[model samples]
Target chain A: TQEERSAATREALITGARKLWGLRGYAEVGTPEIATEAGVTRGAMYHQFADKAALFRDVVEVVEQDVMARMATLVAASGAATPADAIRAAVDAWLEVSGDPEVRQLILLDAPVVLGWAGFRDVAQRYSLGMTEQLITEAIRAGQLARQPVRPLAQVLIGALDEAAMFIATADDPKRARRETRQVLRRLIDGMLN
Target chain B: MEIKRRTQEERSAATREALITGARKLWGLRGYAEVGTPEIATEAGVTRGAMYHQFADKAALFRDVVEVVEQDVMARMATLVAASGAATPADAIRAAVDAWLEVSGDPEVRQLILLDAPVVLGWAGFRDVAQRYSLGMTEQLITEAIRAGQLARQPVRPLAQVLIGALDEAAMFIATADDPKRARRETRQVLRRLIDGMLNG
Candidate 1:
């Protein structure tokens, strides 16, 4: 019963916090309000997490994890025959994720500011970078890419993706920004292909 | 009274110069977080009150220092790129990359412009400064390359932004690598490939 209660509290806090934060971002949403929304006491909020930053970190993880999973599904669903095809699928999926307003706010706009570059990249490396490296490695093995190092390529590719997301988020015309970025992203990947 | 006012303006200019030089030296070496306003003022040979009068806070002072470093970097890049005497716009862009690699090798540039600015100023703030100089320069070159039929005739701004991102990441890669010399060489190779991607092949 106690273990169930603990799990329930954690889930409720995360769910409510995600809703508030996804709507308002990290700074404006306070712990008291998060507690009230979750129907938990302020003490319960602290009991489950250290502070606002810690809670936001969890919320980011939730978002990133979902993005990562969906990305995988999209890549697989494309039924890519070659590594290059798979990478194209992956890039499209990433650009699509960047178009989401919630993801734009939480991950692109606020995560780096809240977690710092290192912290933000640390989480990203766990999800996006890992997946990217896998795609690059497969491409290389399949003779789709040159035999240059994979890590640097993946890092730079992720950098481009990260910057594209930021551009889309901050652009005066996000719709056009996304379209242009997707085209440029294709060229970057095409350059690597055999 | 006119003479006194002119001298006071001169005094203000001198103090501004000293404080900037002071903060640059300290922040360049120790980074923004480690160095304080008091230390910077002391380094500049100005009083704490004088430092605050010059800058609203440490971050404001660091912003100036970052702009100074960025300008210096751009100047150095131009000089080196001109010295390179690349025959074409595409070649000039390549030379510019080499210059970026060289200028960014400075510890102060690596620490301040590359490392701390984003964290201190936030992404938007950091981009605001960079867009004026670094990104602007890249866009200019990309436009030239496109006009000269060296690069494909695509939208210049997004391509420039993406290329800048790649180069910025490369700088960070070289900065943190244990074998920076080897890393620089490898980075040059990888960067050339990325550039070739943009070229009208």
Candidate 2:
């Protein structure tokens, strides 16, 4: 029961932080308010996190993990009979996340500026790169993708997807932006296969 | 005896050049965050007041250094692209992409522009500066290719931005890789495939 309460307390704090940070930004929000929003005590918030930055880092990680998991589920759901199918599904998953207003603002906009590029990349690589490399490795193993180096290929696609999100996030119409990016992206991936 | 006097503009240009030269050496080798304005001033053999007069602050100085390096990089890339005698826009993009990957091996470009500029100026600021040079050039290439029979029409700016993002990220990967030579070869191979897709698909 105690452990359950502790877990619930942490979850509440994250939800509160996500909401407030999503509404404004990490720099604008305060700890006390986060605790108040979570309905957890102020001391409890401090006990869970060392500082605002620490909490923000955790928030980024949580969101990233969720995003990556969604991508994996999407790829799996496609049954990825071919490497191209898997890759397309992965791109779609990224586009979906990029189109989400709250996630885009939190992950793509505020996170990089708040954590610095190196720190943000570090957290992102842990999930996005890891999964992407695995996806590529499996595709190559199955002879779905032509024989080539996995590392650089994965790195390039991660960059492409990231930039795709930036395009969507900053566009006048995210829906239109998302569709166009996917169009160009599919063109590139199909070329890779040839 | 009458001595020849240096004009005010000439003297100012000299001072700025000295500061930039000293700054590029220090920042290139040690990175932007680790080096200080005082170190740059002393290295230039210029006074603190002179350094401040030449630039606003360390960020401003770093920004200037980034500009100089990027301009040089752009000029070098143009020379490479022209020298390649690429027959088509796609060929030119391939040449330019490979040239950029090679130039990224340079310590100054790798450190000042690739590794540190985005962190120092912020990504938006970095992109804004980038647009003035390389990004602008990329947009032209896309526009030309579209106007010609080679490629399909699309939103040129966004497409160029995405492509630039890929090249920049790949360069960083090579710059920070354990074996940059190997990484470079791999990135070029991958990039060739991608460019082919862009042109053909």
Candidate 3:
């Protein structure tokens, strides 16, 4: 029962940490302040999170998990009849999720700079790169897409998708940019099929 | 004397180059938001007086550095385009795209120009210089490809925008990569498929 309750504090801490770091940014946010916002004791925070950097990393992992989860659920439910349709769902899901300000701030805006570019990429490859590669690799196997090197194509397409997603967040009218992004991506996806 | 006038001009030029050089190293190592004018001045071995006299503010100095770095890459890209022995427009555009990503794999180019330039300079400013340096040329090359019937008729603008973004991200991967050589090779394989898909036009 005590362990389950501490787990509650961990949830609050993660939620509160995301809210703080996403809004105020990394340099100014302090752990005590986050603990206060999260409504947990500083001692509890240390016991669970270790420190601010550790908590921020946790925030990154949580947000990335949400992205992968959302993408998977979306692809599963989109009633995609073909590999092409499924991959398109995957692409569009990223655009949709990246529109959320919290997701944008934590993963796109702050993570690369704070986590170190290489470190940021490592966590990102965990979900975005790996999943996209699987989608494309599977497409080729089903003869739905053209025969090409699976790894590099996924890396590059994911690279472009990452840009499109980030651009949608920073864009003046995100909805408009999202639509335009889909159009451009559609052309590229079209080209991938034989 | 004419000699003194020439020497004074030479000294001012030296200060400007030092500032550009030091600022590039600093900005590439760190980034734009974290760096400041006084530190930049100190690193360049120039007085704040010299800095203020030479440039209006930190933004202006940073702008110059961006130009220097961008133009350097632009010139290299032009040479790459020249040496590409491509027979058709499709071949040429692919070669151009590959060359830019390949060269930008250098950590310094990736950090200073590819990563920092867009963020440090406002989007419009960065886009303007970026398009002028390479985008315009790339568009022209694509136009030739289409006119040559190598590519299908499609909106070139969005296609170009996405490719630029992709190459920029790929370059970041290369710059911060543990194995940049292989990272670039992987980048090329993927981007080529992407281009092939687009060009199946």
Candidate 4:
């Protein structure tokens, strides 16, 4: 019973922190506030995590992992028959993920700025970038893609999506944002395919 | 008959104008977050109390600053668009790129309009204004150009959005760097390629 309660408390703390991050960003919110929101004392919070940065780092890791899992599932479900379909699927999944305004503001905008660029890059490399590289490499090997440097292209594509997400999330009308994103993705995919 | 306009109101308005000019200069050098009310007041050669009296708060001042900066950028774009009279769609696209690189690339314009506006006013509000302004002005123009057979027939709004977004991102990247000229060149190259890809009809 004690272990179960401890696990529940830890989960609550994490969930509370995640929600707060979405609202106020990581830089604006404090750990004590998060702990209180989770119905735990500062000491109890420390017992669960070594420090505030540690707790935030853990949250980032979990979120990144979850996003990566979802992306992978989406890709697999697409059953892309060709390299172009694979690329399109990748683009669609990324757009779909970033379309969630709360997730975009929390994970993309606030996390990188609050956690510092290097920290965000570290997580991105481990999760999104690595998978993206793998897909590009697969397309290259299958002879469906041209012989271009994968990493730079991946960076551009990712950066494009990042900018698109920021624009869409901050747009007044979500529908217009979605329309623009779909059109842009089509152009991008067409460019890449041919 | 000629008239000379002079009044206490005009003089006070001039002082307010000077303050905004000085504030814009300071904001250009150091970002909005880094600049303070006192510094702006000092630069304007006015008292901090005067600065406060003139504006509600720093955020309000920054908002006015953004309006001025946005107007200045729009004026430059208007000039470029006008200069492309009777030019091919490809030439018109290149003209747009050149105008963006030359005008939007200005440090003061980039800092006050692109960077500070987002940081001071919330990102959502800043982007909302940008989208509205962009859609109303350049987006509609480009779309009309395409529809009228002056530009290539393709989806214009998305292309405009991508081009504007890319230009903004590239400008920010360059503005933050030691040598922004390289950023300008790279931006122009990529932009030209994108335009060619879309408008090689």
Candidate 5:
């Protein structure tokens, strides 16, 4: 019962931190403030999270799960049959996340800077890059894409998908950004499809 | 008096050159921000005052370092791309990625510019310089490739940004790899696929 309560406490703290960080930014939110938001003490916050960074990491993971779930659903709803078709749908799904304000603030703008490049990249590798590599392999085998090196080509696509998000995130107008990115993505995808 | 002036100007340039090289070597190898300031100031065999004099701040020092090095890097890459004598823009794109990879593989580039630079120069500031500089060159190539019928054009700025963003990531990837040579080879292969898709896919 005690352990269950502790776990619940941790979850509550994370949820609070995620909301704060997601809305404001990592730089804007402080550690004690997260504790306050969670209705917990500073000691309780530390007991649950080693430090602010550890908490941020957990928050990032939570957001990544949210993003992965969103991507999976979007891609499935895309219902594309071919491998190239699937990849394009996946890119489209990724663009959707890019336009999402929470993701724009938390993942695109803050995560890379707060986590450092390598750390930021690891989470990305585990989620997006791994997903991209799998699809690239399928596309190549299905003769829907080029038969170039899988992991590296996947890296390039990862770069592209990631940039598309930033394009929306940084754009003066998110709608225009989305339209422009999607439009360019069409031509870029034309270059990718077999 | 004029000769003395020339010598002082010459010495200042020499000190700047040496300081950049020294910092490049030291900062690239290990943790930079952990213990960089006084140490870097005393490098180049110049007075710490000299280091502070030329640049308003240490980050400014590194900011200047990145610009000059990138200029040199871009120039050298153009030479290699020319030497490869690529028949098509697609061919040249591959060679462009290849030779630039070799030059960027430098410890000078890998450590100072790639690793510590963002930390030193500030991410927002570094990104601003990049958008207008090296990545800008990439934009023209994409435009040129499309014009020459060597490739299909996409959103020019975004595509160019995407390419260099990946290239920068790839550079760090190779530098941090246990076997960078193999990493470079693998990255080159991947980049070729990416560019091929742009032109031929």
Candidate 6:
């Protein structure tokens, strides 16, 4: 009974938090509204999380962790593959994850502005920068990349990928985005490697 | 009689040109929604009533401004294409990048054409027009280069779309950056690399 209660509360909080992200925090949705959407009572919602901010933070943490976990798995699976294959897999994984509207809006639109620069940076550095750096190091070790400052190159590649993903995610024709991204990715890989 | 006719035609042309210029300037600075007809009229040194007499509404003024911006870009591109005649495909690609930065960097063009136009007229309509015009110009260049054995045998449409899309993204990146000069330099470098990779690959 205790474990069931905890699971139910956690699910309610996650669902409520996701709804808040979609509706936006500025809109006037009270605890009751969130509880109703989450199919839980206000008491249950408050029991699980201290407040709305706590719930929101938990939601962001979940998303960040999920994304990072997926990225880690992809990188690990591509262990024996060539550097180019690894890069393509990374790009594909990023596109697939970011294609979801919730992820796109949360990361690109809400995260930096709503979460504050410091908070967003901390999360991104912990996840994005670390992953990119590891990939660069791996590529270099494989003799698939030239010697250069990995940090700056990683930053540029990440920025370009972010911008490209944002555009494709919002475009009317997503197919065009896929084609463009493939071209850009190919160029980026070619430029990086010998 | 000839002198009188020429004077009338010149006056009409000047008035039309003034209205279009005013629209471009205002639309570029503040965007379409934030600007008004009176502001445009004032900028053009014409009466509000005169602007109404010349164009149907704000949308019409915007359409006119789009035409002007498109024409201006096409003219510059024509020059670049002509001068790039003896250059390699990579060089031509670099020229294209420069042309995009030069044109899209303008506040008026950036605001009115790239940003505001999509919001005001819908992204589909805006991109449709852009794709139509861009495809026409790119097809001609690609055909010429291919006939001359300058470029590889890749499909012209995909190549053109890739070039245009990359430049579009680069231009937006430059415009949105707080330090545009640095952004421009990085964009130029990336674009050059992209072109080289495409051409050589």
Task: Give the per-residue lDDT of model 5 (tens digit) for A80-133.
Answer: 898888888987888886667778898999888877766777888887876787
Give me the chain B TM-score of candidate 4: 0.78
DockQ score for model 5, please? 0.37
Q: lDDT by residue for model 3 over B35-84, one digit each (tens)?
A: 89889899999999998878898788888998888888877877887799
The residue ranges of model 4 lying beyond 4 angstroms of the native Cα positions read A1-8, A16-61, A81-84, A99-156, A163-180, B1-12, B30-36, B84-86, B114-117, B149-162
Model 5, B61-137: lDDT tens per residue? 67767777777778888899889989877677788888778888977677766677666665566566656566756
Listed for every candidate in order, the interface RMSD values in angstroms are 1.6, 1.4, 4.1, 4.3, 2.6, 6.7
What local lDDT does model 5 show for residue A193? 82
Candidate order by DockQ, decreasing, is 1, 2, 5, 3, 4, 6
Residue-level lDDT tens digits of model 6 in B82-188: 67663665456567667777877877777877677665655445656677667777676666667667666655654565556556656666766788888777777
**TM-score winner, 1 or 5:** 1
Put down candidate 1 lDDT per residue, A54-136, tens digits, no spaces: 98899999999989988999898998999999999999999887777788889998888888777887888888778998999
Please list all clashing residue pairs in model 1, or write none if there are none. Answer: none
Pairs clashing within candidate 4: none
Decreasing lDDT order of the candidates: 1, 2, 3, 5, 4, 6
- Return the number of clashes found in candidate 5: 1
User: Could you give the C-alpha RMSD of every candidate to the true structure, in order shown?
Assistant: 1.9, 3.3, 6.0, 5.7, 3.7, 8.0
Fraction of true contacts retained by every candidate, in order, equals 0.58, 0.69, 0.49, 0.12, 0.38, 0.08
Docking class of 5: acceptable
Off by over 4 Å in 5: B1-17, B25-43, B52-61, B82-94, B118-129, B149-155
Candidate 3 TM-score restricted to chain A = 0.90
Please give the range of 10 consecutive residues that has the lowest summed lDDT in model 3 chain B: B118-127
* Tens-digit lDDT track of model 3 for A43-96: 889999767889999899998898788888888988988888888888778777
Over 4 Å off in model 2, which ranges? A1-6, B1-13
Give candidate 3's whole-model lDDT.
0.79
- Who is ahead in lDDT, 4 or 6? 4
Q: Which candidate is the best by DockQ?
A: 1
